A paper describes a structure:
Apart from the primary NHR mutations, some substitutions on the CHR helices also contributed to the T20 resistance as secondary or compensatory mutations, and in particular, a substitution of the polar residue asparagine to a positively charged residue lysine on position 126 (N126K) was frequently identified during the in vitro resistance selection and the treatment of HIV-1 infected individuals. In order to reveal the structural basis underlying the N126K phenotype, we determined the crystal structure of the C34N126K and N36 peptide complex. Two peptides form a canonical 6-HB structure, in which three C34N126K peptides (CHR) bind to the central trimeric N36 coiled coil (NHR) in an antiparallel orientation. All residues of C34N126K stands out clearly in a final electron density map, indicating 6-HB containing C34N126K is highly stable. The crystal belonged to the space group of C121, contained a complete 6-HB per asymmetry unit, and diffracted the x-ray to the resolution limit of 1.65 Å. In sharp contrast, our structure demonstrates that when N126 was replaced with a positively charged lysine, residue K126 attracted the negatively charged side chain of E123 and tilted its side chain away from the hydrophobic pocket, hence the interaction between PBD and the hydrophobic pocket could be further stabilized. Subsequently, we found that H53 side chain shifted to a conformation parallelly to the side chain of Y127, indicating the π-stacking between H53 and Y127 restored. In addition, the distance between carboxylate side chain of E123 and Nζ atom of K126 is 2.9Å, indicating a tight hydrogen bond interaction.
Human immunodeficiency virus type 1 (HIV-1) entry into target cells is mediated by its viral envelope (Env) glycoprotein, which is initially synthesized as a fusion-inactive precursor polypeptide (gp160) and then cleaved into the non-covalently surface subunit gp120 and transmembrane subunit gp41. The sequence structure of gp41 is defined with multiple functional domains, including the fusion peptide (FP), FP proximal polar region (FPPR), N-terminal heptad repeat (NHR), loop region, C-terminal heptad repeat (CHR), membrane proximal external region (MPER), transmembrane domain (TM), and cytoplasmic tail (CT). Two hydrophobic pockets in the C-terminal portion of the NHR helices play important roles for the stability of 6-HB, thus being considered ideal target sites for anti-HIV agents.
Numbering used by the authors:
A (entry chain N), C (entry chain E), E (entry chain B): 546 to 581
B (entry chain C), D (entry chain D), F (entry chain A): 628 to 661
């Protein structure tokens, strides 16, 4: 059970990290549009 | 960009919490291995 | 078996996220070079 | 930048898929424990 | 034992990736302030 | 930016090593299932 619970925790962390990554990509694209 | 800031803040806080939860669980699991 | 398979899954996700990260770093470096 | 765009797209899809597979395995594992 | 160790490994990877993410965030914010 | 650079390199190298170690452990865990 503990192991399975921990897997859930890690998966959730990976998902949140993915949202953050998507946000940084947006930002980079915005900056590139103005900068180039 | 304001919405961007809001979202960054949101997910950063969430990840921090998840990481802490995971750390606690890691300790518990190691302890149970004994 | 299921737990081990799930560790593989998570590792693969982390690896894919790492590629993404490296791509964001490249982009930021390109932009930094132009602005400064 | 053109290659960058291509790779962003490629890895984003890959991650989405892995996340999906992981969610499915998580539910299977949980059911097996029950 | 191996499984729990792997979990630690994965968590550590996630943490390091989070550090990198925070770094990319810092970079984007710097660029954004310099241009906008 | 100079400190940023330093830190990017540091964490990039750390992640690479952690991934490597996780890969090794994964194959050990898979072997152990037999």
């Amino acid at each position: 059970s503990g192991i399975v619970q921990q897997q859930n925790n890690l998966l959730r962390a990976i998902e949140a990290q993915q949202h953050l990554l998507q946000l940084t990509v947006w930002g980079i694209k915005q900056l590139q549009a103005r900068i180039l | 960009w304001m919405e961007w800031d809001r979202e960054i803040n949101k997910y950063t806080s969430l990840i921090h919490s998840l990481i802490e939860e995971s750390q606690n669980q890691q300790e518990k699991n190691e302890q149970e291995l004994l």
